Amino acid sequence: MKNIESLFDYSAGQFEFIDHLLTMGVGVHFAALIFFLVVSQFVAPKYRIATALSCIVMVSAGLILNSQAVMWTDAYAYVDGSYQLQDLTFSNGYRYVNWMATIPCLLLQLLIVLNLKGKELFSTATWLILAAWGMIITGYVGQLYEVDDIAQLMIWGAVSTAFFVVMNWIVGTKIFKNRATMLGGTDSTITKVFWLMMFAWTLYPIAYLVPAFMNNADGVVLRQLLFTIADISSKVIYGLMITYIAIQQSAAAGYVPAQQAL
Ligand SMILES: CCCCCCCC/C=C\CCCCCCCC(=O)OC[C@H](O)CO
Ligand SMILES: CCCCCCCC/C=C\CCCCCCCC(=O)OC[C@H](O)CO
Ligand SMILES: *C/C=C(C)/C=C/C=C(C)/C=C/C1=C(C)CCCC1(C)C
Ligand SMILES: CCCCCCCC/C=C\CCCCCCCC(=O)O
Ligand SMILES: CCCCCCCC/C=C\CCCCCCCC(=O)O
Ligand SMILES: [Cl-]
Q1: Strands (DSSP E) along the chain, which ranges?
Q2: How far does Cα 163 stand from its chain's mean position?
């Protein structure tokens, strides 16, 4: 009842489009899961955890998208020409809780292919995960107010954005100071990964703000469309680039299975 989805009835077209976006997302993530599993054998031991992390991200996100899809169909029934709320079973809060797990995985796979190790790896991962959890937790509290108190959504969102900015500064600083260590020309690729991340991750706060600027049933659809674009870009496309970097550096380091695969 704290999310705008509960305020509206939906046309068949709106309801089915949201359902199809979520189910398509499930399929894309589980198809990518198989790809990452199969190619892990072509990654040198030093980087193989990066591809395993993509597998974990695919199943984590795919399970949450599947849960959202079933919750969506459980919550609404077609009555008198529209889909109307029957049960309090749908909310976006499950996405936020899941980010507590998937964001650390996405960040850790980056640090691994950047060739960080030992104390710098552990220290950098700790600050990044704390910053990310601060961003997620404050955003989670903010969206509890997207119906009742837009001013509160905005203030928690400002606090969350401060964590996002500091997190991005840590990431960008480590990338630019370490790309010279990267093998096989991936010093160029990693810069594109950073820009892909900046673009894709910024779509999430835009979705968070939909209740402030498009508080209607079409805004509900737009938010799910933005989450879909952002999920595929930040998890699947990003994961494919991380895997490319991992295989390319593996081959440059003399790992035969990587050399033959390329
Ligand atoms: C009264 C309410 C409380 C107000 C306070 C809440 C807001 C504080 C937010 C950010 C400050 C922390 C930023 C400090 C981060 C420095 C550590 C760091 O980033 O290390 C990166 C390094 O590159 C890796 O080795
Ligand atoms: C809540 C409202 C507060 C609004 C606050 C607005 C300030 C935005 C500024 C920067 C965004 C952070 C983007 C980080 C981009 C990476 C920067 C970086 O990596 O620096 C390069 C490095 O110095 C080379 O060695
Ligand atoms: C696969 C999921 C990903 C990459 C999720 C990323 C989420 C964010 C970058 C969330 C950012 C937020 C803000 C910067 C302020 C508004 C609240 C958030 C949590 C939506
Ligand atoms: C309060 C929360 C703090 C969370 C900190 C998490 C720390 C994680 C640190 C690094 C994990 C990396 C483990 C795998 C190392 C891979 C390196 C390799 O095998 O080449
Ligand atoms: C996620 C990015 C967050 C950006 C920070 C928000 C910037 C705040 C700008 C002006 C706030 C104006 C407050 C007006 C409250 C409206 C109350 C209402 O109409 O219900
Ligand atoms: Cl997720």
Answers
A1: 76-79, 82-85
A2: 16
- Domain span including residue 189: 4-261
CB 235 within 8 A of CB 53: no
Looking at residue 222, which CATH number applies to its domain? Answer: 1.20.1070.10
Ligand 5 binding pocket, CB closer than 6 Å: 150-151, 154, 157-158, 161, 205, 208-209
Task: Please choose, from the candidates 244, 170, 164, 174, the residue with its C-alpha nearest in 3D space to the C-alpha of residue 201.
Answer: 164
Could you tell me the distance, in angstroms and rounded to a whole number, from the CA of residue 99 to the centre of ligand 6? 5
Elucidation technique: X-ray
φ, ψ of residue 88 in degrees (nearest 5): -85, 80
Nearest ligand for residue 160 CA = 3
What six digits make up the tokens of 9?
A: 């009835």
- Which one-letter DSSP state was computed for residue 209? T
The C-alpha atoms of residue 104 and residue 134 are separated, in whole angstroms, by 12
SS3 77: strand
φ, ψ at 79 (rounded to 5°): -135, 125
C-alpha distance from residue 262 to each of 169, 179, 224, 244, 249 (Å): 33, 22, 37, 10, 11
The number of domains in the chain is 1
CB atoms within 10 A of CB 82: 16
Rg (CA), the chain: 20
Query: CA geometry: angle at 217 spanning 202 and 22, to 5°?
Result: 60
Please state, in angstroms and rounded to a whole number, the distance separating the CA atoms of residues 156 and 143: 9
| Cα–Cα distance, 151 to 142 (Å, whole number) | 9
At 82, list the tokens. 């529209």
| Ligand 3 pocket, mutate which of 53, 164, 223, 233 (most atoms under 8 A from CB) | 164
Q: Which of 232, 230, 193 is nearest to 210 (CA)?
A: 230
